[PDB]
Write a protein that binds this DNA or RNA. Structure first.
Ligand SMILES: NC(=O)c1ccc[n+]([C@@H]2O[C@H](COP(=O)([O-])OP(=O)(O)OC[C@H]3O[C@@H](n4cnc5c(N)ncnc54)[C@H](O)[C@@H]3O)[C@@H](O)[C@H]2O)c1
Ligand SMILES: [Mg+2]
Lengths: 56, 273, 123, 157, 309
RNA sequence: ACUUAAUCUCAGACAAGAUGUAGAUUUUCAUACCUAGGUAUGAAAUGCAUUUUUUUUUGUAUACAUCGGGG
RNA sequence: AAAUUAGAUGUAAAAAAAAAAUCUUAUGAGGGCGGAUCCGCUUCUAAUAUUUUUUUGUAGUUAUUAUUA
C-alpha cells in the first residue's frame, strides 16, 4: 500500500516587480510585500550592459 | 559565358516585441480561479514570520489587513477559505476583481505607507501615492509614426526600405571575396549606418527569393538573413545604395506595402507575434 | 531560542495534520470544474499547435533556401555549393561570446520602462 | 611487478602442477612474434627458475654490450616454488617454446653467439629460431606445406 | 448529413450565453440565507483512499488531475515572463543559429549498438557476453541536434544545501530549512551524510542538510529572480564557470552565504533568522539539452554570462 | 571472453573552410570608368605549402583518444 | 587525496490484408484404417514458430513546394 503524499506548500502572493528602468511585471512569490522596487538589477549592471556609457 | 543568376545577400533586421502579449479573457478568469483555489490548499500566512510585533510595518499591515477583511492576499478579492461560506469561491460573470487592471490597482494601493515611523496612522490626505506604471501604448502608437521603434511594443517590427520606387529589405550583390553573412553585415552598415547595435543570428539564410531570368536578363537569387537590433535607429544619410526612405512595419502592415510575390517568399520566416 | 521558536511555528503549520484537507466538491461544482479543466487543456493544445506550426514553417523556409543555395554556383569562379558549405560552419556558435549578453538579457515585461527604446546608442 | 618478481603473495603456497603439454594441435608460444630471432627450448618441458632466467639475460647483455638491440622476454616467473616456505619464483615452459627474442642493428652471427652462450646457462637444449619459420605442433615443425590437420589425420602412411 | 445526425442533438456547448436579467437574480449568498436549513447530502460520498493498495482493489484512487484527489495542486497562476520570452523570440534564433541542412532524400541513420558483440570464426565467440562500453565505464548519452522538434528548455532546478556543522549545533539545520522554504516556495526534504571522516568530524547517516526540486513554471520564475535580481547584485561576480556541466545537459554552480541573503525573499525577513546562520546552497539547473555545449548555449540565450574557468 | 601474473603496439584520420605565398595574367564576378564590350583597379579560379581530433576550425566517422612526476 | 547534491543506453505507440511451403502441437473435425477417449498408422482444418519467403497497402492530419482551376 503505497502512500499518496500531499503537497505541503506555503501561502503565495502575486507581486509586482518594478525594475530600475521603470518596467513592471507580475510574479508569484511567498513574500507579503506588494511592490518590489529594484534599484539595482541586470538593467543597471555593467556586466549585463557593457555598451552603456552612463553606467561606465 | 556570363553567369545566369546574380547572387544577392539580404538582411531582415527585426525588433522583437518588448512587452508580453495581452492576456485573453479565459486566461485572466483562469488565473483568478486558480489563485482562489490556492487559498483553500496552501498553509495560512504567519505575519510573525515577516513583521515584528508593535512596529510600523506590523501596525501598517494590520490596518490594511483589516481593510481586506483578513485576506492576506491583494488580488483575490474577499474570500475566506474556512467557515460556512467557503464554498462560494466562483465569481459571477463580469467580475472586475478578476481583471488585470483591478489587480494592479489593489497591489499599488498597498505599496503606500499608511503608518509613520512613530506608529501613528498617516492622514488619508497626506499619503503619498506610488509612481504608477508606464502605459503599454506609447506616444508613437497614437501618433502613428512608422519611423519609430517604440510603436507596437507587443509585436515584431521589420525594417523596410525604399529604393529610387519599390519597398524591400536591405540587399546587395555578393562579391567573390566575402560570403553571405559577411555581405549582409556590410550592406546593413552602408544602408542604415553603423549607429545601430545589431547581431546577425548566424550564417544560415532564413528565406530566399528567386527572380527567374528573362531569356536577355540575368536572374536574381536573393538570400535573406535575419538580424536583431538591440538599440539604435536607422539613418539613411550618406548611404551608398540609392535608398530614400525607411520605415519599421509590423507583419500586418508589411504585406500591404511589399508586393505579393516578394511577400509570399518572406512570409515563412514570420513568427507568432 | 525565541527566534528559533518562530521558525518552528512555521514548520508546525506545514505539518500534514495542520494543512487544509482535500477539497470536497458537489456534482454541479465538480462538473463546472471539469469544463474549466477540459477547456484549459484544449486551450494549451491550440497554443501548442500554433507554436509548433510556426516553428515548422520557419524550418521549411530555412531548408528551402539552404537546399536551393546548395545547387547555385558563384560568385564568379567559385565551385558550386561553396556558399552552402560556408554557411554550415559553426565557428564560435558554441563559444563564450556566441550570443550577445545584452540581446538575451533583455526580456518581455508587462509594462514598459521610463525609456522604452534608446535611439541615441552610438557605436 | 616484473617478469622475475610477480605481484603475488609469497605466503599463499601453490601446488607443483605440470607444464602445458599440448596434445590437441596447439602452437602457442612456438613462433617469434615481436623480435627477429628467438631462443627455442626444443627437447622437453621444464620449470625454469628466476635465477636461471636472470643469468641468461645477463649472459646476452655481456656479449652484446655496447651495441643497439632490443631484448624481449616471452616468459614470466609467476609460479612460487616452495622448498621445505617460499624459495623462489619459477616458470613452466612447454616444448619448442620461445624463451627470448631480439631485434636491432646486429649481425646474425653475433646474435647466434649470444643465444648460444645463453643456451648453456639455461637448463635443457635450445635452438636458434628466425622470424617467419613455421610453428611447431608438439615436436614436429609444420614445414613443406604440412598443416595441423595432416598431423591429426589417422592416415599418414 | 448522417454523420451529423449521430451527434448529440441536445448540445449544451451550443447554448446561448446567459442573459443579464437572469444574472441579476442569481445570488448564491441569498439562497443559503433564505433557506435557514441544511440541504440533504447526496448519496455519492466517495472520497479518495489514503492508501493505494493496488490496481484491482475495489476502492481505487482518482487521477491527480481530479480536484478531490489528495495530490491535486492548483493550476498555473500566471505566465512566467522568462518562459514567454524564450519561446516567442529566442526559440526561433537557437533553431536558426544551430542548424545543419539535411538533403531531401538522406537515408535515416542507424544507431550503432554500443554494447558490442563478438563476431568471427572462433567457436568461442558465439556465447561470449556482450562487450563492455568502449572507453568510459558508463555509456554517455548521444547528443540530439537542435531542430524545430527539439528546442532545449529548462525542466527542473534542484537547490541542495550541505551543512556539516549542523550535527553539533542543531539550530543550523532548522534555519537552513527555512531559508530554502522562502527562497523556493516548497517544503525541503532533509538529507543525511553518507561518509565518515574523523578529521572533518563528519558522521555517517545523520541529518546534515536539506534539498528542494521545483518543476514547471516555478522553475522559470526562480531563474528570473536569479539572473535579474540576485546574480546582478553579487559584488565582483564574474559569471558561471565555463567548465560547469556533467556531460548530459545539466548546469550546476554554488552560491556563497552572503549571496543567499540577497534573495528578495530572504532579505525582507533577514532579521528573523539568528545571526550567521544563513547557509550556502548548490543550484543545479536541469534542462532538456543533450550536451554541455547545448546547455551552455541555452543559458546564454537566457542572459547568463559565462567566464573562462 | 570474465578473472590472475607478465609483456607488446597505439593514443590518432579524412572532407570542407580558413590562412598566407611564389606565380600565370586567362575567364567570371565586384568597383573607378570610358564607350553593351573593352580600358583599368581588385577578388576568385589555379599548384604545392599552412591550420584540423577537442583548439580561436567546424563537420563526419570514432573510446572527444590520456594524467602527474623526474631528466 | 578524502564531506553534499544533480547526472550518466536506445527504441516504439493510425493501420495492415493476402498466397503457398516446412515441421511441431490440438481434450480440433468425438476424422479414416488397424488394433469418441488407449495405442500404431494416418489425410483435413486451426494455432504457434520459422522463410530473405510471394506480395499488396504504408494512409490521414498540420505545413512546405510544384502544377492545375
Ligand atoms: N503536455 C501535453 O499534453 C503534450 C501533448 C503533445 C505534445 N507535447 C509536447 O510536450 C512539450 C511540452 O508540452 P506543452 O506544449 O504542453 O508545454 P506547456 O508550456 O503548454 O505546459 C508546460 C507547463 O506550463 C504551463 N502553461 C502552459 N501554458 C501556460 C500559459 N499560457 N500560462 C500559464 N501557464 C502555462 C502548463 O500548466 C504546464 O505546467 C512540447 O514539446 C509539446 O510538443 C505535450
Ligand atoms: Mg643447457
Amino acid at each position: 500500500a503505497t502512500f499518496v503524499p500531499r503537497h505541503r506548500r506555503p501561502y503565495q502572493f502575486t507581486q509586482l516587480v518594478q525594475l530600475s528602468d521603470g518596467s513592471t511585471f507580475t510574479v508569484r512569490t511567498t513574500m507579503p510585500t506588494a511592490l518590489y522596487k529594484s534599484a539595482k538589477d541586470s538593467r543597471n549592471h555593467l556586466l549585463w550592459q557593457p555598451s552603456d556609457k552612463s553606467l561606465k | 559565358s556570363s553567369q545566369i543568376y546574380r547572387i544577392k545577400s539580404g538582411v531582415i533586421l527585426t525588433r522583437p516585441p518588448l512587452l508580453t502579449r495581452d492576456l485573453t479573457p479565459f486566461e485572466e478568469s483562469f488565473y483568478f480561479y486558480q489563485k482562489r483555489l490556492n487559498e483553500r490548499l496552501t498553509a495560512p500566512f504567519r505575519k510573525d514570520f515577516y513583521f515584528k510585533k508593535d512596529t510600523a510595518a506590523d501596525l501598517d499591515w494590520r490596518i490594511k489587513l483589516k481593510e481586506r477583511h483578513g485576506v492576506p492576499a491583494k488580488d483575490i478579492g474577499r474570500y475566506n477559505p474556512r467557515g460556512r461560506m467557503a464554498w462560494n469561491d466562483e465569481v459571477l460573470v463580469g467580475s472586475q476583481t478578476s481583471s488585470r487592471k483591478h489587480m494592479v490597482e489593489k497591489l499599488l494601493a498597498d505599496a503606500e505607507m499608511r503608518v509613520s515611523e512613530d506608529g501613528e496612522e498617516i492622514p488619508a490626505e497626506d499619503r503619498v501615492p506610488v509612481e504608477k506604471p508606464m502605459p503599454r501604448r506609447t506616444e508613437a502608437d497614437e501618433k502613428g509614426d512608422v519611423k519609430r521603434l517604440d510603436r507596437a511594443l507587443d509585436k515584431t517590427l521589420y525594417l523596410v526600405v525604399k529604393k529610387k520606387a519599390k519597398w524591400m529589405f536591405p540587399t546587395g550583390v555578393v562579391p567573390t571575396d566575402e560570403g553571405l553573412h559577411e555581405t549582409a553585415a556590410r550592406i546593413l552598415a552602408e544602408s542604415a549606418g553603423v549607429n545601430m547595435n545589431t547581431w546577425i543570428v548566424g550564417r544560415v539564410p532564413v528565406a530566399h527569393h528567386v527572380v527567374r531570368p528573362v531569356f536577355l536578363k540575368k536572374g536574381e537569387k536573393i538570400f535573406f538573413l535575419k538580424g536583431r537590433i538591440m538599440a539604435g535607429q536607422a539613418d539613411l544619410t550618406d548611404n551608398l545604395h540609392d535608398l530614400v526612405d525607411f520605415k519599421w512595419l509590423t507583419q500586418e502592415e508589411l504585406r500591404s506595402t511589399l508586393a505579393e510575390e516578394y511577400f509570399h517568399s518572406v512570409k515563412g520566416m514570420f513568427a507568432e507575434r | 531560542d525565541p527566534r528559533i521558536i518562530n521558525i518552528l511555528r512555521h514548520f508546525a503549520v506545514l505539518s500534514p495534520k495542520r494543512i487544509p484537507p482535500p477539497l470536497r466538491f458537489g456534482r454541479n461544482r465538480y462538473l463546472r470544474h471539469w469544463t474549466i479543466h477540459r477547456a484549459w487543456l484544449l486551450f494549451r493544445r491550440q497554443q501548442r499547435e500554433q507554436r509548433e506550426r510556426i516553428l515548422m514553417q520557419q524550418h521549411q523556409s530555412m531548408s528551402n533556401a539552404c537546399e536551393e543555395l546548395r545547387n547555385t554556383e558563384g560568385p564568379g569562379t567559385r565551385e558550386t555549393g561553396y556558399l552552402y558549405r560556408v554557411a554550415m560552419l559553426k565557428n564560435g556558435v558554441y563559444g563564450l561570446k556566441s550570443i550577445p549578453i545584452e540581446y538575451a538579457s533583455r526580456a518581455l515585461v508587462e509594462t514598459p520602462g521610463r525609456q522604452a527604446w534608446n535611439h541615441e546608442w552610438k557605436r | 611487478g616484473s617478469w622475475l618478481e610477480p605481484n603475488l603473495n609469497r605466503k599463499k603456497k601453490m601446488m607443483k602442477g605440470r607444464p602445458r603439454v599440448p596434445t590437441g594441435g596447439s602452437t602457442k608460444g612456438t613462433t617469434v612474434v615481436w623480435g627477429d630471432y628467438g631462443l627455442r627450448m626444443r627437447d622437453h618441458h621444464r620449470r625454469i627458475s628466476a635465477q636461471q632466467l636472470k643469468l641468461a639475460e645477463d649472459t646476452i647483455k655481456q656479449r652484446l654490450r655496447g651495441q643497439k638491440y632490443r631484448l624481449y622476454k616471452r616468459v614470466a616467473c609467476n609460479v612460487g616454488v616452495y622448498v621445505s616456505s617460499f624459495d623462489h619464483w619459477a616458470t613452466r615452459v612447454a616444448v619448442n617454446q620461445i624463451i627470448f627474442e631480439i631485434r636491432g642493428q646486429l649481425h646474425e652471427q653475433v646474435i647466434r653467439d649470444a643465444f648460444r652462450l645463453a643456451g648453456h646457462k639455461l637448463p635443457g637444449l635450445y635452438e636458434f629460431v628466425k622470424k617467419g619459420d613455421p610453428p611447431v605442433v608438439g615436436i614436429t615443425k609444420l614445414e613443406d606445406g604440412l598443416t595441423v590437420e595432416d598431423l591429426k589425420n589417422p592416415r599418414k602412411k | 448529413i448522417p454523420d451529423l445526425a449521430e451527434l448529440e442533438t441536445r448540445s449544451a456547448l451550443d447554448a446561448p450565453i446567459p442573459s443579464e436579467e437572469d444574472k441579476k437574480e442569481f445570488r448564491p449568498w441569498k439562497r443559503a440565507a433564505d433557506r435557514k436549513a441544511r440541504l440533504p447530502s447526496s448519496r455519492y460520498q466517495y472520497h479518495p483512499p489514503k492508501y493505494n493498495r493496488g490496481p484491482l482493489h475495489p476502492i481505487q484512487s482518482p487521477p491527480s488531475s481530479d480536484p478531490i484527489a489528495r495530490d491535486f495542486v492548483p493550476g498555473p497562476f500566471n505566465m512566467p515572463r522568462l518562459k514567454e520570452t524564450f519561446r516567442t523570440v529566442m526559440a526561433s534564433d537557437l533553431m536558426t543559429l544551430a542548424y545543419i541542412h539535411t538533403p531531401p532524400g538522406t537515408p535515416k541513420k542507424e544507431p550503432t549498438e554500443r554494447l558490442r558483440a563478438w563476431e568471427g570464426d572462433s567457436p568461442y565467440f558465439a556465447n561470449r557476453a556482450r562487450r563492455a562500453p568502449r572507453g568510459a565505464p558508463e555509456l554517455p548519452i548521444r547528443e540530439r541536434d537542435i531542430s524545430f522538434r527539439n528546442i532545449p528548455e529548462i525542466k527542473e532546478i534542484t537547490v541542495s544545501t550541505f551543512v556539516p556543522l549542523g550535527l553539533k549545533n542543531p539550530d543550523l539545520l532548522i534555519v537552513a530549512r527555512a531559508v530554502l522554504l522562502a527562497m523556493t516556495g516548497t517544503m525541503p526534504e532533509m538529507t543525511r551524510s553518507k561518509n565518515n571522516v574523523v578529521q572533518w568530524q563528519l558522521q555517517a547517516n545523520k541529518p546534515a542538510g536539506c534539498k528542494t526540486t521545483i518543476y514547471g513554471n516555478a522553475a522559470w520564475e526562480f531563474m528570473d529572480r536569479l539572473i535579474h535580481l540576485v546574480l546582478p547584485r553579487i559584488k565582483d561576480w564574474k559569471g558561471v564557470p565555463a567548465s560547469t556541466g556533467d556531460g548530459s545537459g545539466n548546469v550546476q554552480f554554488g552560491l556563497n552565504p552572503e549571496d543567499v541573503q540577497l534573495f528578495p525573499e530572504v532579505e525582507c525577513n533577514y532579521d528573523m533568522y539568528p545571526a550567521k546562520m544563513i547557509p550556502g546552497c548548490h543550484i543545479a539547473i536541469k534542462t532538456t539539452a543533450t550536451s554541455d555545449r547545448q546547455a551552455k548555449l541555452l543559458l546564454q540565450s537566457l542572459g547568463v554570462p559565462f567566464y573562462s574557468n
